[PDB]
Design a protein around this ligand. Structure first.
Ligand SMILES: Nc1nc2c(ncn2[C@@H]2O[C@H](COP(=O)(O)OP(=O)(O)NP(=O)(O)O)[C@@H](O)[C@H]2O)c(=O)[nH]1
Ligand SMILES: [Mg+2]
Length: 402
């Protein structure tokens, strides 16, 4: 195929949708220009900066609404926390306080959810409210409502729109409405129709009050991944500057296979980046000896991936708790927990040695003839596929246990 490095390096990213790239074209060109000239110190530095930006990226998400709107369950769902685990948002807690309480993401501390007090329980008018709540500090400004449209909510929307700014409308408890129509309306019932009506009623409420009509999302916290949740996350990511997508993408709850699959694609681009900033070699990866200086990097990488896909230690026992079984049985459903557990069958070195042969037999080296990433990186790809698979497996169990 292509025996050119600069060319092969950037040729890799065309394997992802324009919106699922984690680095801009411009930045990608910078890296190539340097690489083209052969200036190794500068191309490593360029990549390094690019990853520095991605990581240091901070994300502030503001969520507002009246009590019982679903505001807590929402924020907790976006953090992978139960509605009662230590560090969860509680109802009316912020309302009484009358002050915004932040909630850093457990694994991605750079992602912050700001639970804002319902304007109803504050002696602040719309504009003063936003002012006190520091509106221009959030990347996202969500307004959450349930079945009844609150007059307060309307005024806030009216203030933001009149301000020429944007916000998202997350309507919850849609499940309640579908169960009510099904009950009283035997045949004249249809979730698809009920859904449509609820949506057009939100649309008009905004139009009627002279609001520009924002992105609307109907959903249920008593059964996420079922309605506009997947769409909600796609929209949120799409509205982000490229460099901020990575951190928010990997933070997202693993509610569907697509979310999970989208996470893997992002990380497959990070490995490639790390692989090159680390500099290529001419020795076949399966013929290398793994140093402890490497086994660590790989143990650290595995802990991160596992956490990102919710198949780590905590997440596991948490699931054992629900299903009333034990972690063991759970770890027996997936593969990643075993990787670093010494068994009578083989030692770490022996196992990782095999993973590299299998990976390259199935995927070949990803570069031009006699060019290779350092072994340590092919293993990350391997770990990444294993974790992705595991998350998917467990997600099936979660649903298979209704
Ligand atoms: N059926 C159903 N219930 C929901 C949904 N979202 C939240 N709830 C329910 O509402 C209760 C509490 O909602 P919760 O999110 O705590 O309220 P809150 O909006 O956060 N209060 P606060 O606004 O003060 O933060 C729980 O009983 C949960 O069943 C939903 O989409 N469908
Ligand atoms: Mg709350």
């Amino acid at each position: 195929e292509n025996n050119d490095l600069p060319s092969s390096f950037t040729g890799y990213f065309k394997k992802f949708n324009t919106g699922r790239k984690i680095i801009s074209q411009e930045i990608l060109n910078l890296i190539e220009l340097r690489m083209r000239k052969g200036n190794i110190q500068l191309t490593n530095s360029a990549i390094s900066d690019a990853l520095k930006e991605i990581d240091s990226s901070v994300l502030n998400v503001a969520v507002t609404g009246e009590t019982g709107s679903g505001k807590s369950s929402f924020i907790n769902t976006l953090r992978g926390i139960g509605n009662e685990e230590e560090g969860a948002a509680k109802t009316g807690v912020v309302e009484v306080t009358m002050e915004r309480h932040p909630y850093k993401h457990p694994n991605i501390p750079n992602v912050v959810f700001w639970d804002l007090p319902g304007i109803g329980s504050t002696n602040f008018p719309p504009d003063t409210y936003l002012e006190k709540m520091k509106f221009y500090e959030y990347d996202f400004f969500i307004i959450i409502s349930a079945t009844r449209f609150k007059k307060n909510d309307i005024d806030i929307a009216k203030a933001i729109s009149a301000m020429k700014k944007e916000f998202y409308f997350v309507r919850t408890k849609v499940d309640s409405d579908i169960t009510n129509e099904a009950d009283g309306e035997p045949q004249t019932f249809d979730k698809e129709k009920v859904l449509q009506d609820i949506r057009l009623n939100c649309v008009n409420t905004f139009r009627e009050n002279g609001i520009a009509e924002p992105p609307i999302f109907l959903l249920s916290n008593k059964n996420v991944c079922h309605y506009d949740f997947p769409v909600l996350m796609d929209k949120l990511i799409s509205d982000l500057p490229i460099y901020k997508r990575h951190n928010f993408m990997v933070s997202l709850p693993n509610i569907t296979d697509s979310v999970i699959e989208k996470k893997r694609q992002f990380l497959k681009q990070r490995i490639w980046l790390e692989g090159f900033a680390a500099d290529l070699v001419n020795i076949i990866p399966s013929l290398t000896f793994l140093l402890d200086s490497d086994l660590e990097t790989l143990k650290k990488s595995m802990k991160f991936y596992r956490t990102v896909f919710g198949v780590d230690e905590t997440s596991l026992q948490r699931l054992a708790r629900d299903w009333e079984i034990e972690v063991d049985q759970v770890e027996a459903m997936i593969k990643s927990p075993a990787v670093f557990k010494p068994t009578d069958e083989e030692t770490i070195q022996e196992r990782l040695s095999r993973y590299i042969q299998e990976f390259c037999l199935a995927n070949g080296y990803l570069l031009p003839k006699n060019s290779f990433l350092k072994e340590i990186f092919y293993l990350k790809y391997y770990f990444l596929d294993m974790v992705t698979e595991d998350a998917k497996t467990l997600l099936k169990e979660i649903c298979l246990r209704n």
